[PDB]
Amino acid sequence: AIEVKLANMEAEINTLKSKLELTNKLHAFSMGKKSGKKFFVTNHERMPFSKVKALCSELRGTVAIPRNAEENKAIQEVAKTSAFLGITDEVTEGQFMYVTGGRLTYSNWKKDEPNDHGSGEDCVTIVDNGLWNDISCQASHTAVCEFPA
Amino acid sequence: AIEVKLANMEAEINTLKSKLELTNKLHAFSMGKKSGKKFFVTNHERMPFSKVKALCSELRGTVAIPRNAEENKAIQEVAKTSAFLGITDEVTEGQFMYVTGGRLTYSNWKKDEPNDHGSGEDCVTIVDNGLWNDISCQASHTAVCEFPA
Amino acid sequence: AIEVKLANMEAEINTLKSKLELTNKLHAFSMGKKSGKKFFVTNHERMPFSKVKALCSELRGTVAIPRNAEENKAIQEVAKTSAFLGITDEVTEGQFMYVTGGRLTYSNWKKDEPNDHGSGEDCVTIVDNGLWNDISCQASHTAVCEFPA
Ligand SMILES: OC[C@H]1O[C@H](O[C@@H]2[C@H](O)[C@@H](O)O[C@H](CO)[C@H]2O)[C@@H](O)[C@@H](O)[C@@H]1O
Ligand SMILES: OC[C@H]1O[C@H](O[C@@H]2[C@H](O)[C@@H](O)O[C@H](CO)[C@H]2O)[C@@H](O)[C@@H](O)[C@@H]1O
Ligand SMILES: OC[C@H]1O[C@H](O[C@@H]2[C@H](O)[C@@H](O)O[C@H](CO)[C@H]2O)[C@@H](O)[C@@H](O)[C@@H]1O
Ligand SMILES: [Ca+2]
Ligand SMILES: [Ca+2]
Ligand SMILES: [Ca+2]
Ligand SMILES: [Ca+2]
Ligand SMILES: [Ca+2]
Ligand SMILES: [Ca+2]
Ligand SMILES: [Ca+2]
Ligand SMILES: [Ca+2]
Ligand SMILES: [Ca+2]
Ligand SMILES: [Ca+2]
Ligand SMILES: [Cl-]
Ligand SMILES: [Cl-]
Ligand SMILES: [Cl-]
């Protein structure tokens, strides 16, 4: 009894992990996940940057970060409106870093941006052009999370 | 050994439960669930009110109910077409009650409605412009379920 | 007590099985699955037929197969563009079969199709007015999977 049931439950658990993995694959597929590509998702809600990070973090993802023109357009198409990117110069003014760490490689700044305008701008938004503009982290923009390829 | 295997398996189960909960959160987010708000969703299928209640119940949700103008708009954008709301005046004519209990607070009736037209109309549908019209519960309208915030 | 913990583990597993089943039902509902009808899903990615089969197979579904006009319209609405169908005449030229078995019955060929054009065409794509054309299995078309009613 005991040992047999325990061995069976281990098989039940492994079967459940396999099924859940399959469910996640199907959901990613229905969400637009392209083979071997990272995918972006949004609930179309606009909120302050701190809430986007908290939200993507709960979902075990990160605030969307374009690493090249392709991904930049991908995020643009997903958001449809202005959306925060996982990039800020909160730590050292003028030095934009990825929220995931490290200095910005690819960038697509609008002319004369980032400019830390007025009272200050430490966050970044991809606008309805794919271009970038630094804006107040307190402002509310579309939440777009990123998940691994 | 047995007590050890059992302990390790309970750990695996706790991890799997959290992982499934994450799947549910990501899915709701991808379908438009806003922070702190109820999740509204539809399969675009039109059916009699009885079937809508049965369908949402089977999913552990309930027929969508607008508690205010904001929710009414959210349901409107999910349905696109005429859809049943979880409200009826089956007990006392003219007294609309939520199928989950309690008297109707917010309402968005169309002009000249409710009119308990013809042989009688005890169900409610959100239609054009998001306004309401009472209709026969036997009529087929889009199924929209709601899940807790 | 070992046996008490084992009994709890069984209940935890069964509870998990029930919740995962619910998660699958809510996802199918959100993807447009109609009561008693199979449903269709796409990530909008274009790829050769062999890749579509592999992808859908891995998700425990199959390349979409229209069995009547309703399903054909449904697949057309989901795909938005040209997509492979689970129909080919690879096994015996001229005789189309479903990838899951059986000779083609219902069909919606464009005029003058199928024509096994050029060096040959053994796969099938649903194109413009939801009409069908046989095409090379090597060409890349939208991946659309179908899942059981
Ligand atoms: O204060 C925000 C923003 O203002 C200026 O840019 C404008 C805005 O991005 C927005 O309203 O759209 C305008 C174009 O339609 C754009 O000029 C700049 O001062 C910018 O640096 C600043 O972040
Ligand atoms: O008896 C049903 C319903 O009929 C009338 O409303 C019409 C219907 O909702 C539907 O056909 O769309 C029409 C607008 O295009 C609308 O007028 C009303 O008599 C209504 O009270 C009644 O419930
Ligand atoms: O060899 C491909 C295909 O070519 C011809 O049809 C064309 C294609 O179906 C597609 O590109 O759309 C065109 C119209 O928009 C159409 O002419 C046919 O020879 C066809 O049988 C063949 O499979
Ligand atoms: Ca600063
Ligand atoms: Ca700054
Ligand atoms: Ca700026
Ligand atoms: Ca009545
Ligand atoms: Ca009535
Ligand atoms: Ca009426
Ligand atoms: Ca052939
Ligand atoms: Ca020929
Ligand atoms: Ca052929
Ligand atoms: Ca052809
Ligand atoms: Cl700021
Ligand atoms: Cl009625
Ligand atoms: Cl071929």
Domains of chain A as residue ranges with CATH: 1-149 (3.10.100.10)
C35/B59 Cα distance (integer angstroms): 13
Instruction: Please state, in angstroms and rounded to a whole number, the distance separating the CA atoms of residues C13 and C7.
Output: 10
CB contacts, 8 Å: B19 with chain A? 20
Structure tokens at B134: 């009472």
Closest CA to B81 of B129, B115, B30: B129
With beta carbons under 8 A apart, name residues in chain A contacting C23.
23
At what resolution in Å was this solved? Answer: 2.0
Scored b (16 or more CB within 10 A) or e, A18-30 reads ebbeebbebbbbb
Contacts of B58 in chain C (CB under 8 A): 25
For A18, A95, A101, C90, C112, the CA distances from C83, given in Å and listed in that order, are: 29, 46, 41, 18, 19
**Token couple for A12:** 């039940």
**Rounded to an integer, what is the distance from CA C56 to the centroid of its chain?**
7
Say if B26 is an interface residue toward chain A (CB within 8 Å): yes
Return left, alpha or beta for B65; rule: phi > 0 is left, psi -120 to 50 is alpha, else beta: beta
Q: How far apart are CA C1 and CA A126, in angstroms?
A: 58
Closest ligand 1 atom to A114 CA: 21
Distance from CA of A115 to the nearest CA of B (A): 31
End-to-end CA distance of chain A: 44
The answer to whether C75 and C120 are in contact (CB under 8 A) is: no
Contact criterion met (CB below 8 Å) for A147 and A38? yes
CA dihedral C47→C48→C50→C53, nearest 10 degrees, is 40
Give bridge partners of residue B42 from the DSSP assignment.
B144
Q: State which H helix or E strand residue A40 sits in.
A: strand A39-47
Nearest to C140 by CA among C70, C47, C25: C47
The HSE-up count of residue A120 (CA atoms within 13 Å, CB side) is 9
Work out the burial of residue A114: count CB atoms within 10 Å of its CB; fewer than 13 is exposed, 13-18 middle, 19 or more buried: buried
- B6/C contact by beta carbon, under 8 A: yes
Q: Say how far apart CA B25 and CA A106 lie, in whole Å.
A: 31
Any alpha helices (H) in B47-133, and if so which ranges? 49-58, 69-79
Pocket test for ligand 3, best of C109, C113, C133, C138 (most atoms within 8 A of CB): C133
Q: What is the DSSP letter of A86?
A: E
Asked whether the beta carbons of A47 and A140 are under 8 A apart, the reply is yes
Distance (Å, whole) CA B63 – CA C55: 35
Task: Please tell me the residue having the least CA distance from ligand 3 atom 14.
Answer: C128
